[PDB]
Amino acid sequence: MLIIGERINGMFGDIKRAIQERDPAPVQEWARRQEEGGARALDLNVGPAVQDKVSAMEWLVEVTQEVSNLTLCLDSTNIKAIEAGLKKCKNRAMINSTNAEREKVEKLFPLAVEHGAALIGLTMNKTGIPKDSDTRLAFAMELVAAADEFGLPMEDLYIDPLILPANVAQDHAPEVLKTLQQIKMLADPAPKTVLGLSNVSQNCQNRPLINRTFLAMAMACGLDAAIADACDEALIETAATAEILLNQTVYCDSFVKMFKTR
């Protein structure tokens, strides 16, 4: 399981105040505490506030890789900011994200191969987020076909069925699992998958109980990556345990400690 830190996001207070005045201290501190939690990836988002997405993204990268060697994850809908950030990356990074829109595919898939990075693909288009797994799976195959079309390693493709809150979109959660499980019939080797785990507990009671529960249920369906709370110790335990139950890592009595210090 790949834990991607989602604390460094412009929607958060301290992060947004940091980018405005270019304060590296709050950003770097969360880059450590998430890594200490067991996260092997750091998702960077500038937020909707800052008008200049391009330069703000480059700043988040240059100060994060300064105190961490983890695989950075660029999070912006603006392609101009993504490519701008990739040029500043000192190591392997991730592009988040792209949809089945051809206008986006033709200008992001080559970009992924160009920098040799990872590309996260969304199962959607200009319309929005579907429900039926048969629909999401259709968008996913285009992303798989796009990888082979532009010469991108299939193991570098992360398909995201886009999970919605479990209260107002309860019928989405089982459809996401039904999507993940059937992704294994797309390619050989099959592409990896990723989810924004925190979204499933959006405005629900006892968020951690819903987050870690859905994480386990997703890994059983073949979840290869997840963007969730890296500071949640109760979540890291579930991620480690579920990985053991999938026989992805040899069992030991310190299996939880081995996940954090992996």
């Binding site: 799976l137 259709a138 195959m141 285009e142 798989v144 076909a145 082979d148 059937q182 019939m185 797309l186 390619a187 050989d188 099959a190």
Partner: protein, 441 residues
């Protein structure tokens, strides 16, 4: 069971929707889900046939060596590691004998080959075939050799002659049986394919290297014969491990239909000791049939021992017979030990009791293969199953004293079993390595 990509990268990419599906990529999804049949789209030809033959079929083809109870099955494997699942068909052992030898030397050697069956640990090891190679200058010596061997032995056969005419002349009288035809080469594969076609026998494919093997196989397959065994021509054990792995890998992981057949390995080591060790590497490296030269029982035993061990299902544990087993002389006044039929528990006690020396009896109760703690928890090892086995051998008459020894682990069974049995109970050590410390006491 077929990837949407694999299905897609084989379609006309017209997006006409004559299949009842907007695009081909969407129709590829429908095939992987089985929403529609592939016979719908009238387009393409060889793509549809190749896919169906590759989709619903094992990675390694199954070619049987002859007919009857003597015949063994080769190939048919789906794993690279034994622990992932299991290794099905054991390696076929074949002893090679020259044809330029005299009649008295031939019969004497063949007779020794028929006695290469071993008996160890309640198991039975047996070889498979005998290799008859053409070394003589006269083609008539080959037909006189095979006919001579076929009279003495009832085992399988495998003929080794380059010239098809020399082979058929010898194959005529033994055609109804097994004889594996070694080997079809890129210069004489045409006549060889026809010989195994009329006689319905397996055919060996030779090729100097990995690439030459692929080209020759595809040609033989297109002639109407699939039952083949591959020989990458690897004469070195290092050169063999690499090549042997590829055939097993490419056919399973990449669905390579040219390498979807079992492998025949040839030992080249001069020293008979180095030959067996080179055979151990082969039987471990996915080789289905190996051709040895040494026919000594001193060499075939450790080789056939490793062959048996490797091809045992990890899930079923190894089990010894449910019978009293005697260690040493046993005077009729020796101690009585009780333990489980699990093969790793039994020989934890046999090696430890026999190590101390002196006679003793050792009752292996039938747990179905489970260990003392194991069968304890599964209830297949109670004070009841033990006392009933006490009387399933009429043990008391054999031994003057009434006393038995129970595992330190399951020693609690002590009270309840000492009553139903009518036999006194002494609880030994937790570990059998204390069998030396109990006898002293």
């Amino acid at each position: 069971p077929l990837t949407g990509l694999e299905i897609y990268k084989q379609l006309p990419k017209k997006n006409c929707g004559e299949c009842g599906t907007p695009t081909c990529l969407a129709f590829a999804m429908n095939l992987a889900s089985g929403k529609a049949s592939l016979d719908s789209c009238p387009y393409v030809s060889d793509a549809a046939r190749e896919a169906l033959d590759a989709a619903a079929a094992p990675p390694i083809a199954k070619v049987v060596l002859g007919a009857g109870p003597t015949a063994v099955e080769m190939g048919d494997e789906t794993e690279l590691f034994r622990h992932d699942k299991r290794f099905y068909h054991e390696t076929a052992i074949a002893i090679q004998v020259s044809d330029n030898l005299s009649s008295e030397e031939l019969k004497a050697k063949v007779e020794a080959i028929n006695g290469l069956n071993f008996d160890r640990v309640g198991q039975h090891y047996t070889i498979q075939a005998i290799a008859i190679r053409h070394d003589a200058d006269d083609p008539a010596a080959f037909k006189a050799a095979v006919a001579s061997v076929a009279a003495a032995t009832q085992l399988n056969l495998v003929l080794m002659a380059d010239d098809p005419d020399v082979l058929k002349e010898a194959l005529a009288g033994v055609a109804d049986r097994k004889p594996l035809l070694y080997a079809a080469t890129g210069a004489n594969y045409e006549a060889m394919t026809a010989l195994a076609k009329e006689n319905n026998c397996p055919l060996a494919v030779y090729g100097n290297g990995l690439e030459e093997l692929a080209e020759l196989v595809d040609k033989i397959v297109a002639l109407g014969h699939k039952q083949l065994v591959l020989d990458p021509g690897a004469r070195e054990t290092s050169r063999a491990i690499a090549d042997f792995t590829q055939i097993r890998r490419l056919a399973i992981k990449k669905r390579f239909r040219s390498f979807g057949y079992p492998i025949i390995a040839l030992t080249t080591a001069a020293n008979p000791l180095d030959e067996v060790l080179q055979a151990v590497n082969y039987v471990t490296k996915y080789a289905s049939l190996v051709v040895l030269r040494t026919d000594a029982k001193e060499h075939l035993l450790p080789l056939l021992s490793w062959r048996q061990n490797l091809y045992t299902d990890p899930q079923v544990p190894i089990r010894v017979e449910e019978k009293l087993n005697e260690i040493g002389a046993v005077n009729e006044n020796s101690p009585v030990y009780v333990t489980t039929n699990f093969s790793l528990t039994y020989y934890s006690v046999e090696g430890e009791i026999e190590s101390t020396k002196i006679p003793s009896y050792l009752l292996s109760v039938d747990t179905d293969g489970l260990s003392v703690l194991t069968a304890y928890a599964d209830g297949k090892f109670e004070a009841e199953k033990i006392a009933a086995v006490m009387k399933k051998v009429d043990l008391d008459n054999k031994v003057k004293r009434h006393r038995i020894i129970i595992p330190g682990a399951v020693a609690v069974l002590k009270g309840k079993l000492e009553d139903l049995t009518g036999w006194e109970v002494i609880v030994g050590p937790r570990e059998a390595s204390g069998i030396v410390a109990f006898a002293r006491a």
